Ligand binder design. Structure first.
Ligand code: HEM
Length: 249
C-alpha cells in the first residue's frame, strides 16, 4: 500500500553517503542496539486511526525524550547529532530510521529496504503509546495491532530485535542482555526464550507472553528453528515499522 515520494538526486546521494558513515560510526561506538531502539521508539508511537505519531523526527524534541519509555535515548540523539550535521539535506525522520536499518545490518542482520522522504513534523505524539514490558499478549495487540496496524507475525518478529542489546536498571529498571551475544543479530532471542531462564540473561514479561499465546508461539518456534525465516519476516516487519504513516499510512 505504499507510494514513496520522489526525492532529488542530491537527497539520494546523501542517503547513500549517510548510510556508509552510519555503519562506521555505529560499529565503532558499539551503539547499534541503542540506535535500533531509537528508530523503534520513533516509529512505534504511530496511531493508525488518527494518523498521529510515527517516524517523523519528533523523538529529538526534549518533550518526547522526556517520556519515561525513552529513558536513555537522549544519549542516542546526542551521539548522532555531529553526523546528522554532515547531512543537512536529510530529514531527522529519515536519518533516525536509516540509523535503525544500519544498526541491524552492521550487527549481521538482514538488509531492511529503505525508502527516503519522511518529513520532520512539529508535534510529538502524546506519551504512553509504547508497550509496557510487564504486560502480555492482549497489550501487545492493542499497541502493535490496534494502534500501529502491524500483524501478529510482525509482533513476534520485531520482538526479535531484543537479539541485540540489553536493559539497564537506570533506564527501564530491567537489567542485562537477552542473549550471550548482544552485538550479534541472530535468532538467539528465540532460542533463549524456548530454553528457559538461564542465569545472566533477561526475559521481560512481554517476551514471555509470546510463549503462551496460541498465535505467537508457533512463530517463536519457527524463528528458533529457522533463522532465515526469522530474517525474512524481521526485514518485512522492520520495513513496515519504519514506514508507519509514511508513503500511505
Ligand atoms: C514487544 C514489545 C517491547 C517491549 C515491552 C520492549 C521493552 C524494552 C525494554 C524494557 C528495554 C530496556 C531499555 C533499557 O532499560 O535500556 C528494551 C530495550 C531494547 N529494545 Fe525493546 N521492547 C519491545 C519491542 C522492541 C522492538 C519492536 C524492538 C526493535 C525491533 C526493540 C528493540 C530493543 C533493543 C535493541 C533494546 C536494547 C537497547 C540497548 O541495548 O540500549 N524492542 N526494550
Amino acid at each position: 500500500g505504499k507510494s514513496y515520494p520522489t526525492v532529488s538526486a542530491d537527497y539520494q546521494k546523501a542517503v547513500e553517503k549517510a548510510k556508509k558513515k552510519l555503519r562506521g560510526f555505529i560499529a565503532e561506538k558499539r551503539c547499534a542496539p541503542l540506535m535500533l531502539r531509537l528508530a523503534w521508539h520513533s516509529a512505534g508511537t504511530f496511531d493508525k486511526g488518527t494518523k498521529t505519531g510515527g517516524p517523523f523526527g519528533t523523538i529529538k524534541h526534549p518533550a518526547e525524550l522526556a517520556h519515561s519509555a525513552n529513558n536513555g535515548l537522549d544519549i542516542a540523539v546526542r551521539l548522532l547529532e555531529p553526523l546528522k550535521a554532515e547531512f543537512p539535506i536529510l530529514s531527522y525522520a529519515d536519518f533516525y530510521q536509516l540509523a535503525g536499518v544500519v544498526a541491524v545490518e552492521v550487527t549481521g542482520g538482514p538488509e531492511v529496504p529503505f525508502h527516503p522522504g519522511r518529513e520532520d513534523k512539529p508535534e510529538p505524539p502524546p506519551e504512553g503509546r509504547l508497550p509496557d514490558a510487564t504486560k502480555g499478549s492482549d497489550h501487545l495487540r492493542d499497541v502493535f495491532g490496534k494502534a500501529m496496524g502491524l500483524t501478529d507475525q510482525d509482533i513476534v518478529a520485531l520482538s526479535g530485535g531484543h537479539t541485540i542489546g540489553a536493559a539497564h536498571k537506570e533506564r527501564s529498571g530491567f537489567e542485562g542482555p537477552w542473549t550471550s551475544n548482544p552485538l550479534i543479530f541472530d535468532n538467539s532471542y528465540f532460542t533463549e526464550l524456548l530454553s528457559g531462564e538461564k542465569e545472566g540473561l533477561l526475559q521481560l514479561p512481554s517476551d514471555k507472553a509470546l510463549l503462551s499465546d496460541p498465535v505467537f508461539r508457533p512463530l517463536v518456534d519457527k524463528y528458533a528453528a529457522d533463522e532465515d525465516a526469522f530474517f525474512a519476516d524481521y526485514a518485512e516487519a522492520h520495513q513496515k515499522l519504519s514506514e508507519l504513516g509514511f508513503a500511505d499510512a
